[PDB]
Protein backbone atom coordinates (compact mmCIF):
# COMPACT_ATOMS: atom_id res chain seq x y z
CA UNK A 1 0.00 0.00 0.00
CA UNK A 2 2.82 2.43 0.82
CA UNK A 3 4.52 1.67 -2.48
CA UNK A 4 1.27 2.41 -4.32
CA UNK A 5 0.99 5.68 -2.40
CA UNK A 6 4.60 6.67 -3.17
CA UNK A 7 4.50 5.54 -6.81
CA UNK A 8 4.90 9.14 -7.98
CA UNK A 9 8.17 9.78 -6.12
CA UNK A 10 9.50 6.35 -7.05
CA UNK A 11 8.74 6.98 -10.72
CA UNK A 12 10.37 10.42 -10.57
CA UNK A 13 13.55 9.04 -8.99
CA UNK A 14 13.62 5.76 -10.97
CA UNK A 15 16.28 6.95 -13.46
CA UNK A 16 18.52 8.11 -10.59
CA UNK A 17 18.30 5.23 -8.09
CA UNK A 18 21.35 3.12 -8.89
CA UNK A 19 21.45 -0.39 -7.48
CA UNK A 20 24.26 -2.96 -7.36
CA UNK A 21 25.10 -6.23 -5.62
CA UNK A 22 28.34 -7.07 -3.82
CA UNK A 23 29.76 -9.77 -1.59
CA UNK A 24 29.67 -7.81 1.66
CA UNK A 25 31.66 -8.07 4.86
CA UNK A 26 28.91 -10.33 6.23
CA UNK A 27 29.96 -12.95 3.65
CA UNK A 28 26.50 -12.64 2.07
CA UNK A 29 25.37 -10.97 -1.13
CA UNK A 30 24.23 -7.46 -0.22
CA UNK A 31 22.42 -4.87 -2.31
CA UNK A 32 23.66 -1.27 -2.32
CA UNK A 33 21.59 1.75 -3.39
CA UNK A 34 23.12 5.05 -4.48
CA UNK A 35 22.47 8.17 -6.56
CA UNK A 36 23.19 8.57 -10.27
CA UNK A 37 23.43 12.14 -11.53
CA UNK A 38 21.65 13.30 -14.68
CA UNK A 39 24.93 14.54 -16.16
CA UNK A 40 26.54 11.14 -15.63
CA UNK A 41 23.60 9.30 -17.18
CA UNK A 42 23.56 11.61 -20.21
CA UNK A 43 27.30 11.13 -20.65
CA UNK A 44 26.77 7.38 -20.45
CA UNK A 45 24.08 7.55 -23.14
CA UNK A 46 26.35 9.62 -25.37
CA UNK A 47 26.97 7.44 -28.46
CA UNK A 48 30.78 7.45 -28.17
Amino acid sequence: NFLELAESILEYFRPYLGRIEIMGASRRIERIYFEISETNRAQWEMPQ
Binding site: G18, R19, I20, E21, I36, W44
Partner: protein, 48 residues
Protein backbone atom coordinates in the same frame (compact mmCIF):
# COMPACT_ATOMS: atom_id res chain seq x y z
CA UNK B 1 36.74 -15.86 -38.22
CA UNK B 2 35.65 -12.28 -37.58
CA UNK B 3 32.00 -13.25 -38.02
CA UNK B 4 32.47 -16.15 -35.60
CA UNK B 5 34.04 -13.84 -33.01
CA UNK B 6 31.07 -11.48 -33.23
CA UNK B 7 28.62 -14.37 -32.91
CA UNK B 8 30.49 -15.72 -29.88
CA UNK B 9 30.30 -12.32 -28.19
CA UNK B 10 26.56 -12.13 -28.83
CA UNK B 11 25.95 -15.69 -27.62
CA UNK B 12 27.90 -15.16 -24.41
CA UNK B 13 26.14 -11.89 -23.62
CA UNK B 14 22.74 -13.51 -24.23
CA UNK B 15 23.47 -16.77 -22.39
CA UNK B 16 25.29 -15.76 -19.20
CA UNK B 17 25.58 -12.71 -16.97
CA UNK B 18 28.78 -10.72 -17.39
CA UNK B 19 29.26 -10.10 -13.66
CA UNK B 20 28.32 -13.26 -11.76
CA UNK B 21 28.50 -15.70 -14.67
CA UNK B 22 25.31 -17.58 -13.81
CA UNK B 23 23.42 -18.97 -16.78
CA UNK B 24 20.31 -17.44 -18.26
CA UNK B 25 18.07 -20.43 -17.52
CA UNK B 26 18.26 -20.08 -13.74
CA UNK B 27 17.13 -16.47 -13.95
CA UNK B 28 14.53 -17.28 -16.60
CA UNK B 29 12.87 -19.55 -14.05
CA UNK B 30 11.00 -16.26 -13.43
CA UNK B 31 9.24 -14.31 -16.24
CA UNK B 32 11.88 -12.20 -17.99
CA UNK B 33 14.16 -13.10 -15.11
CA UNK B 34 17.38 -12.83 -17.09
CA UNK B 35 16.33 -9.49 -18.58
CA UNK B 36 15.55 -8.11 -15.13
CA UNK B 37 18.81 -9.48 -13.73
CA UNK B 38 20.94 -7.94 -16.47
CA UNK B 39 19.05 -4.62 -16.45
CA UNK B 40 18.56 -3.96 -12.72
CA UNK B 41 20.38 -6.47 -10.52
CA UNK B 42 23.80 -6.93 -12.17
CA UNK B 43 24.17 -3.95 -14.51
CA UNK B 44 27.56 -2.87 -15.84
CA UNK B 45 26.38 0.73 -16.09
CA UNK B 46 25.27 0.63 -12.46
CA UNK B 47 28.63 -0.75 -11.36
CA UNK B 48 30.52 1.97 -13.23
Amino acid sequence: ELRDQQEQVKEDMETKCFICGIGSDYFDTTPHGFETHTLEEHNLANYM
